[PDB]
Every structure is written in structure tokens, then in C-alpha cells.
Amino acid sequence: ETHINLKVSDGSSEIFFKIKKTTPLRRLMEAFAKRQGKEMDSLRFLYDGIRIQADQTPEDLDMEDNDIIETHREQIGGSGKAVDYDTEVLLGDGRKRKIGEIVEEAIKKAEKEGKLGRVDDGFYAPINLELYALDVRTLKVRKVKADIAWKRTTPEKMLRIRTKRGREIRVTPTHPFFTLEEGRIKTKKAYELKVGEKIATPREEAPEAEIFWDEVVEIEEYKPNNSWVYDLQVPEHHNFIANGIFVHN
């Protein structure tokens, strides 16, 4: 047998193509893209781990049949609350760990088991992580638990925010923070923040610590290159301490 039929899937959408092993896959993915209603480079085609490039064939990537090419949507419109891989999450035991390591670990543990979740723009995985977060009614630092780890495609632009105190985080343009208007603590999306506006941080990264309202001094829009962004979902309080800042889900 020479010709090979792969299943191309965005998690939801699955289309079966059969092509011969010498064919470049340029038009397989161009066809799938048009079937999805978008042009080819708003999508990401992945075999096992590494991302394909258009001018490759089945044999040079060691293909089999019923093999799958997973596609991930490039976010147009931001809309995907998440943060940079290196964002240091503050664990419930006091230590700090980059959220990307946390999420990738959770993802391969979910994959070795049978509960890795897939969405068109990435993956999620069950987790049970004790974090430090802001108590939305006590307004002091508390312990919480995250149940879902999230790994999504990088948006077309991201925002790096740095505060007068010297805290700095790289987040998607929609990622919300805590603000204070008239005595209201509200949440504001990142792109809504203005230079000089104060966002909530922990005064110390210790339990029962109160809020330090930190003046935002730098807001930088930039084209990223990191390929994946990450987040943690924490029920009830919907936030956690990352890079010394209260980041809201």
C-alpha cells in the first residue's frame, strides 16, 4: 500500500483525507483550512509533538494510517485569558514555580491517563494545586485550589505590565486584574488598564497579607514568539498570586 488516509482534527472538527505518501501536505491543510472557513496560517497543524510545515510529506514524518493531525486555532480577537510560560505561580507551600511547567506536567499526566481535554485553540488538564490567592471577601491572602490547567495558543499581541513596585507580568490582552474605583474592587481587563492606574498586589507573599495597590508604570504591547500561553482555573476566588500580582481568571 502506498497512499495513506489521515484524520485532521481541531478537537471538534474531524475531516478524513487520503493522499499518497510522496504528496506534500500543503493542500491537505489548505483544504482543511478552507473547510473551516479560514485561511491556512490562522491554523496550526501538529503531528505528535512538533508542528508540521507545508512542504512535508507522510514518509519523511514517519506516518501511519488512522494517524491524526491535530489543528489549533490562532486567536484572532485575543479573547483567551492566559499568561506567559515563565510567570511564577506562588504555591500553597511558599515556593514559586513557572505556570508553564505546572501546566505541561499536568498535561502529560492527564495524557498518560485518559482525561486530557482538547479545545480548538489548545488543551486543558485536571489538576489539584494549592495556590496562594486573594480572598475576594476577606481581601487578604489565602490558600485556594486550582482544578483546571489551561494551555492555549498565543494571541497575535500580548501585554507586558510593570509596576512602580517593580512587579512585571506578561499576559494576554484580555487577562483581568484587580482595580479600585471609589472603594469598589472591580476587575479590569489588561488592555483597559492605563499607565498610572493601581492594580492589586500582595503586600507580602504570606497568608493574611493585605493588598498593596501598585501603580502600573509600563504597559507594552508586543508581538510574542512563545507559541503557547498558560493559565490555572481556581473556583470560588477566580484568582491567584503570580509574579507578585493578583491575576484574576
Numbering used by the authors: 31 to 279
From the article:
As the first step toward understanding the spread and evolution of inteins and cross-talks within the “inteinome”, we determined the crystal structures of mini-inteins inserted at the same insertion site within the putative cell division control protein 21 (Cdc21) from the hyperthermophilic archaea, Pyrococcus abyssi and Pyrococcus horikoshii OT3. The cell division control protein 21 (Cdc21), belonging to the MCM (mini-chromosome maintenance) protein family, is one of the proteins invaded by several inteins.
We introduced the C1A mutation into the PhoCDC21-1 intein without additional C-extein sequence and fused it to an N-terminal H6-SUMO domain (yeast SMT3) for convenient purification. Thus, we performed crystallization trials with the H6-SUMO-PhoCDC21-1 fusion protein without removal of H6-SUMO domain and were successful in obtaining diffracting crystals. The main difference between the two structures is a four-residue loop extension located at the canonical HEN insertion site of the PhoCDC21-1 intein. We observed clear electron densities for the entire SUMO domain in addition to the PhoCDC21-1 intein, except for the 30 N-terminal residues containing the His-tag. The interacting residues at the SUMO/intein interface locate mainly on one subdomain of the PhoCDC21-1 intein (residues 37–42, 71–75, and 146–147). We previously observed that cis-splicing of the PhoCDC21-1 intein strongly depends on the fused exteins when artificial exteins are used—even while maintaining identical junction sequences. The observed extein–intein interactions confirm the structural basis of this extein-context dependency in addition to the well-known junction-sequence dependency common among inteins.
